[PDB]
Design a protein around this nucleic acid. Structure first.
Lengths: 95, 106, 82, 97
DNA sequence: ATCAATATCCACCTGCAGATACTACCAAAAGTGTATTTGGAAACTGCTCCATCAAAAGGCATGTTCAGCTGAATCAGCTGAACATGCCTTTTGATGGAGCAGTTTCCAAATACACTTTTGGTAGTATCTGCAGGTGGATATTGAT
């Protein structure tokens, strides 16, 4: 009865954060799930290429960062880069 | 016993994203910052779109975001529109847009 | 005789390009439009190449930088590596 | 006194340039433009000679092809003179706008 | 402008489909904690190959003149929009069975070493030549009358 993962509960959490009285249809959720997978693949992909081009066998938060800059448009990138730097810094100082 | 997600102050699952990076054959190794940074970008992007879709839902006297609202959100936002410029949101329709010369009289 | 850099992409040059493109007759306003277009093209491509440069911690844009940039812009180029 | 009709030389130039493959923009001015644009992204940059070259090849390929679609757009409108609206229509349909 | 057909807009309204809920379990995640390996940053440096510039090259800015193209105006012909009408085909809800997919067993094939052999790339040197330019001479093309 195989297990099919999605990003649904997580999309829902964030949803409640930004619009506490708004719901989401399962088809909308599905699309949401597709979008996350999509962007995941595009970032990971560039990251993958980027590493190769530099004869590196490790994908680090630095690779992801250039990937985000290469992939996302102007203002989305700027803000994504903050949020990720932030998360790492916070993650580094937390063990 | 604290999850890395909470350690990074994130809703999105860092564990899962670390895993999918390995399984997905992107490089030999995956650094520990990688999935944190990515999950963060992933969470940020989804917030940005839900914020905007939420607004379209409200503009429409609806409480539940449906595919049309996501489409309104994406298409109305220059940057999300570029990011998703070669993507089709099933059941989203199009933005109302009639070319000038098409309207009656003068 | 101080001249803007984009203006160094001259009328006769743009004319020649149109020619290879098989254009017989060119409106006077094309030369400025073409300059705009070329600028947006170069920005988009250079932005990406330099991003590759900064990643490699260099101060030189390499042909590979440019080639990689072109590939991800969907304008794959053969002749310069990769 | 000898004079060629408008478009006689133009045709002759189409034929010339279609036969050859040399770049049609002067290297230097193009080089500056490249550097100027780059300066806004990072300062004190140097450029491999081949790097500039690659950029030029790409840029000329791009513009030459955009002129073909542009021309088709002019002809669609029953003209033989390319106009900005033609470049604009081509770029919109290509999905660049 | 005023009169009237007909679309459009809310507002409220019932059913209900789809969403939200909860209780219990659980397989596989995710984390934890320990021992073992190494990828790449950091630091030193050699030599490409890059920016610069001085002398040689040769393409373009320039203003005039008018060929011929573009766009406005006008108009006849007919194509395509609207709508009325008569009814076929799709939509929707209900019921047997193909094949997907989930689990487990088993072996042909691929990974992981390690050592033995070769080939492909650089480099120094020297060796070779296809053809871009130049020439000269005929013939074709274009434009004028």
């Amino acid at each position: 009865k195989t297990r099919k993962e999605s990003y649904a509960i997580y999309v829902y959490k964030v949803l409640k954060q930004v619009h506490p009285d708004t719901g989401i249809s399962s088809k909308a959720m599905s699309i949401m799930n597709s979008f996350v997978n999509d962007v995941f693949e595009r970032i990971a992909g560039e990251a993958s290429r980027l590493a190769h081009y530099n004869k590196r066998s490790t994908i680090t938060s630095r690779e992801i960062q250039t990937a985000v800059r290469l992939l996302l448009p102007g203002e989305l990138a700027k803000h994504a880069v903050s949020e990720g730097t932030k998360a790492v810094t916070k993650y580094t100082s937390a063990k | 016993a604290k999850t890395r997600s909470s350690r990074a102050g994130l809703q999105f699952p860092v564990g899962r994203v670390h895993r999918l990076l390995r399984k997905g054959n992107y490089a030999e190794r995956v650094g520990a910052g990688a999935p944190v940074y990515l999950a963060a970008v992933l969470e940020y992007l989804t917030a940005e779109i839900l914020e905007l879709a939420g607004n379209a839902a409200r503009d429409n006297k609806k409480t539940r975001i449906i595919p049309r609202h996501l489409q309104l959100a994406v298409r109305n936002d220059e940057e999300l529109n570029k990011l998703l410029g070669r993507v089709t949101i099933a059941q989203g329709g199009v933005l109302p847009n009639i070319q000038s010369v098409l309207l009656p009289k003068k | 005789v101080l001249r803007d850099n984009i203006q160094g992409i001259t009328k006769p040059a743009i004319r020649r390009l149109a020619r290879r493109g098989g254009v017989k007759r060119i409106s006077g306003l094309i030369y400025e439009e073409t300059r705009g277009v070329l600028k947006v093209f170069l920005e988009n491509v250079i932005r990406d190449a330099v991003t590759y440069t900064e990643h490699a911690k260099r101060k030189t844009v390499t042909a590979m930088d440019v080639v990689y940039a072109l590939k991800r812009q969907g304008r794959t180029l053969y002749g310069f590596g990769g | 006194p000898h004079r060629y009709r408008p478009g006689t030389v133009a045709l002759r130039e189409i034929r010339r340039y279609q036969k050859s493959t040399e770049l049609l923009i002067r290297k230097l001015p193009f080089q500056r433009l490249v550097r100027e644009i780059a300066q806004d992204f990072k300062t004190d940059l140097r450029f491999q000679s081949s790097a500039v070259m690659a950029l030029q090849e790409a840029s000329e390929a791009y513009l030459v092809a955009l002129f073909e679609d542009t021309n088709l757009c002019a002809i669609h409108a029953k003209r033989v003179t390319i106009m900005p609206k033609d470049i604009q229509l081509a770029r919109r349909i290509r999905g660049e706008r």
